[PDB]
Every structure is written in structure tokens, then in C-alpha cells.
Design a protein around this ligand. Structure first.
Ligand SMILES: [Cl-]
Ligand SMILES: [Cl-]
Ligand SMILES: [Cl-]
Ligand SMILES: [Cu+2]
Ligand SMILES: [Cu+2]
Ligand SMILES: [Cu+2]
Ligand SMILES: [Cu+2]
Ligand SMILES: [Mg+2]
Ligand SMILES: [Mg+2]
Length: 499
């Protein structure tokens, strides 16, 4: 397998605007097929990248910065990965979603607002070439990625992911590490052929002769882990505090991260911005689309090499020589100036009436070919909309998971608070539809006491979340963020209504 830790960690450059005034910022980003080497010892890999880069450029904005992005497709008219024509027109369709954006519905990247090459053909909900992001929200780590109907798992795996950071000037008072000591880490697992080409499966394990070819698969676990577009890279760091913006941009894989020297992470932020209080952690779970804003303090580790290790299995136990590793920190860079950054415990203050409660079951069916189809509340993507909360109101969603696995559930537009999780008897529930609890409520850990947009709904548990639906009304979605589930068919429209 590929030799670990021989490539330096790329730091994506920060995108420069086409035009900027004190009241509006305009960006243009083109999706291009490109070639990049993913490891020292590989030929360059064919990729699809925002501005021909993988990951895409990091976009940095301020809170309330009035931003417009013209996202353009300059990709070829055929895909290089296997398309299953049975799960749901040009073959290649794209649309960009700003994950976590508090975004008007026509700029949110609705899966059926897709466009082909040069906007030549467009989906039924296509309305505008230039997206508007008012950024009227808390400072946070966001990210952008492809969201095209039934192609998301392919377009993302091809390389269409990038970080988007919202900076709230008020948070400067905290003196958190910044500028060159504030580094995004976009983690993607991939399987790469000896010739450098990406591998994505064209059929699952099931040997049924019925299956289409290609056929969608239920989950993808990559052989190799990349960070910022390089396999098992190293980052040289000074002996001081750094801020890392940690993004799981993988299709299916969940990571459980630790430092191999026993050092701790200080978590300062979750998907929806800073936590109320920082949390000292020896390890944390990071499912697809979750973000952790962390400080690592290398001050006491001068000279050390420190592995960012993974203990979570994906289709089996981790292999210590491969997916047990993420990247390596080398604390060998000479300290360039005194570290004036801080790691305050007390970060933010967040103070309500519940207007409605909603019960949602994570369900399955089998399709005509015998393949598993994953569903939200036993409905299909194209069923009439059922999640129709009113604008300005707060609901509790009780998400019941009787399946055997965890699903990272994401709601667009909003962030929400976690109330509790509670285990239930699956068999009982499955025969009767009655909830019977096998233990007490588990209140959220400190990591989940702030604002989330993507949340792990564990097997055999009821997860309750509380969300206020706004500020905008219109047509959004919610879905599992395992992309293989999302595409078939664990995604539903969500209408925030306004009389
Ligand atoms: Cl700093
Ligand atoms: Cl985990
Ligand atoms: Cl609101
Ligand atoms: Cu997303
Ligand atoms: Cu999203
Ligand atoms: Cu799922
Ligand atoms: Cu989405
Ligand atoms: Mg740079
Ligand atoms: Mg059924």
C-alpha cells in the first residue's frame, strides 16, 4: 500500500473575488476536469474540481458579507464514474449546495435545480445562474459540494468539495488562533487504482442476476484516507496552538479521531458555530458532513511526530497500516513569533416555545431487483411534501432509527439543538409500531450542547432535536448525509411555509 506521510498537507488557497465593494462581493467558480497527483508514488489522477482544484478553493467571508457566486459547469458531457440509470437528459448534472448556509431557497442548491455544461440544459427547479449568500448567521465552518439529483455520491467522490469559512469579527475578542495558524482539514477516503485512477464500485456484493449494471451500492468504504487532496499527508507545525477546521467530506465513512501521543483536542465549535463552552476531548466521532472546530496545542510537543489516528471501522475493523491513519503532525517548524493566541473555555452565550412535534422513522424497502432502498418516514423523494413546518416556529423532531446502522441526518437552512437520545426495543417497534424504551434518556454530551446541522442518529435509539424554522421560507430538503443513502432514496423535500 502507499507509503504514509511523505506528502506535505496542501492548504487550499483562499478564493479571490472577481469584484468586491463595501456592500457586495462577487465570485465566479468553474467546475473543471483536471489531473492532480494524490500521492508521491502515483501518476496524476483524473478529478473533477472547483476551479480545477481538489479540494476546491477555500472561500472566506465575514458575517453579513453580501456574497454572490456564479457556479459554472465546464465538465465533460460524460461521467468517468459508474452511473446507475435505474435509481431515478444530460448524463452529467451539477448544482452547488453551501452546506450550513442560511440561504434563500433559490440559492440553496436544490437537487433538481441542476445544470449541465454551460447551463445548456437545466432541471425543473433551475432559476438562477448566480447564487446569493447573505451570510446572516453565526461564524462557523461551512463547506460546499455538489448536490445534483441521483448523482451526489458520484460528483462529490469525483472531487467537488471545498471549505467556506464565515468569520464573525466579534469573535476576535476571543483571540483564537488565526491566519496561518487556522487550517481547514477536509478528510476524504478514496480507493485508487495502481495507475492513479479513482475506483468507485459499479456493483455491490449481492450476486443476483437481476441487478442493473452499473448498480448503486449501499455504502462505500475507501482503502486510503486523504486530507486536503493528499493521501496520508504530514503537516509541519510550530510548537504552539493551532485551530483546525475539521470537515468530513467522505461519502460514507465515519472517523473516530485521536492523537497517538495522548494529546487532547480542545473543541471550540460544532456545525453551527462556537460551542457555549470549550470541551477537552481525547477522541471524537465525525460522520459525513459533520464539522469540528478544534484547537490542538503543540506547545509541549516540540520535535514530536504525532499521528491523527482513526479507530472507527468502515465495513470491518480498521487496518493499523491504512485506514487507522489520517495524517501526521511534525512539530519541527521553528516558532516564528511568540504565541499570543488563547483557548478560552467560555466562548458564547445562547439563551424556545415548541409549536409542533414531529415523529420520523428511518425506514427501508426493497426495490424490484432486491436491493435495499433507504427511506425517510417510509416516503420517496418524489412523494408530495410532508415536512412542512411554518416559518418562525420551533419543532421537536423525534427521529426513530430501527435500522442496524447510524445515519447522519442533515436539515438544510437551519441549525438545531440536541435534546436527547434514548434506546428502544427494535423488534417490538417493528411488529407493533410501539415505542418501548430499554434504558434512560442520554442527554447530549458537551460537544452537542451548541448548534448542529448534521447529527448522528444511532441504531436502536430515538434522537430528539429542536429546530426553529427560518429565517426564510421556501422549498428546502432534509436527508441522510451518507451519500449512497441520500441518492436512493433517503432524502425528502422540506417546505418552510408562510401565510
Ligand atoms: Cl494566532
Ligand atoms: Cl465513531
Ligand atoms: Cl425564524
Ligand atoms: Cu452537505
Ligand atoms: Cu446542507
Ligand atoms: Cu443513512
Ligand atoms: Cu443536502
Ligand atoms: Mg496559503
Ligand atoms: Mg414497505
Amino acid at each position: 500500500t502507499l507509503e504514509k506521510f511523505v506528502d506535505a498537507l496542501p492548504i487550499p488557497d483562499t478564493l479571490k473575488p472577481v469584484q468586491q465593494s463595501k456592500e457586495k462581493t462577487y465570485y465566479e467558480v468553474t467546475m473543471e476536469e483536471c489531473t492532480h497527483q494524490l500521492h508521491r508514488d502515483l501518476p496524476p489522477t483524473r478529478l473533477w474540481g472547483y476551479n480545477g482544484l481538489f479540494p476546491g478553493p477555500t472561500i472566506e467571508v465575514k458575517r453579513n458579507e453580501n456574497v454572490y457566486v456564479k457556479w459554472m459547469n465546464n465538465l465533460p458531457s460524460t461521467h468517468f464514474l459508474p452511473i446507475d440509470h435505474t435509481i431515478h437528459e444530460p448524463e452529467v448534472k451539477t448544482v452547488v449546495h453551501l452546506h450550513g448556509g442560511v440561504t434563500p431557497d433559490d440559492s440553496d442548491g436544490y437537487p433538481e435545480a441542476w445544470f449541465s455544461k454551460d447551463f445548456e440544459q437545466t432541471g425543473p427547479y433551475f432559476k438562477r445562474e448566480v447564487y446569493h449568500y447573505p451570510n446572516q448567521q453565526r461564524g462557523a465552518i461551512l463547506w460546499y459540494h455538489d448536490h445534483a439529483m441521483a448523482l451526489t455520491r458520484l460528483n462529490v467522490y469525483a472531487g467537488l468539495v471545498g471549505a467556506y469559512i464565515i468569520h464573525d469579527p466579534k469573535e476576535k475578542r476571543l483571540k483564537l488562533p488565526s491566519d496561518e495558524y487556522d487550517v481547514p482539514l477536509l478528510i476524504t477516503d478514496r480507493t485508487i487504482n495502481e495507475d492513479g485512477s479513482l475506483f468507485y464500485p459499479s456493483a455491490p456484493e449481492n450476486p443476483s442476476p437481476s441487478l442493473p449494471n452499473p448498480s448503486i451500492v449501499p455504502a462505500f468504504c475507501g482503502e486510503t484516507i486523504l486530507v486536503n487532496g493528499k493521501v496520508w499527508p504530514y503537516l509541519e507545525v510550530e510548537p504552539r496552538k493551532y485551530r483546525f477546521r475539521v470537515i468530513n467530506a467522505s461519502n460514507t465513512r465515519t472517523y473516530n479521531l485521536s492523537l497517538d501521543n495522548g494529546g487532547d483536542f480542545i473543541q471550540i465549535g460544532s456545525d453551527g458555530g462556537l460551542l457555549p463552552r470549550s470541551v477537552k476531548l481525547n477522541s471524537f466521532s465525525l460522520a459525513p458532513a459533520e464539522r469540528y472546530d478544534i484547537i490542538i496545542d503543540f506547545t509541549a510537543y516540540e520535535g514530536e511526530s504525532i499521528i491523527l489516528a482513526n479507530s472507527a471501522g468502515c465495513g470491518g475493523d480498521v487496518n493499523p497500516e491504512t485506514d487507522a491513519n489520517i495524517m501526521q503532525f511534525r512539530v519541527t517548524k521553528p516558532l516564528a513569533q511568540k504565541d499570543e493566541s488563547r483557548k478560552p473555555k467560555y466562548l458564547a452565550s445562547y439563551p424556545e416555545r415548541i409549536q409542533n412535534i414531529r415523529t420520523l422513522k428511518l425506514a427501508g424497502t426493497q426495490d424490484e431487483y432486491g436491493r435495499p432502498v433507504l427511506l425517510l418516514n417510509n416516503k420517496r423523494w418524489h412523494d408530495p411534501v410532508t415536512e412542512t413546518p411554518k416559518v418562525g416556529t420551533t419543532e421537536i423532531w423525534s427521529i426513530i432509527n430501527p435500522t442496524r446502522g447510524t445515519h447522519p441526518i442533515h436539515l438544510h437552512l437551519v441549525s438545531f439543538r440536541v435534546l436527547d437520545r434514548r434506546p428502544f426495543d427494535i423488534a417490538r417497534y417493528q411488529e407493533s409500531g410501539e415505542l418501548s424504551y430499554t434504558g434512560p434518556a442520554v442527554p447530549p454530551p458537551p460537544s452537542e450542547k451548541g448548534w448542529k446541522d448534521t447529527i448522528q442518529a444511532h441504531a436502536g435509539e430515538v434522537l430528539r432535536i429542536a429546530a426553529t424554522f427560518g429565517p426564510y421560507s421556501g422549498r428546502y430538503v432534509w436527508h441522510c448525509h451518507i451519500l449512497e443513502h441520500e441518492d436512493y432514496d433517503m432524502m425528502r423535500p422540506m417546505d418552510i411555509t408562510d401565510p
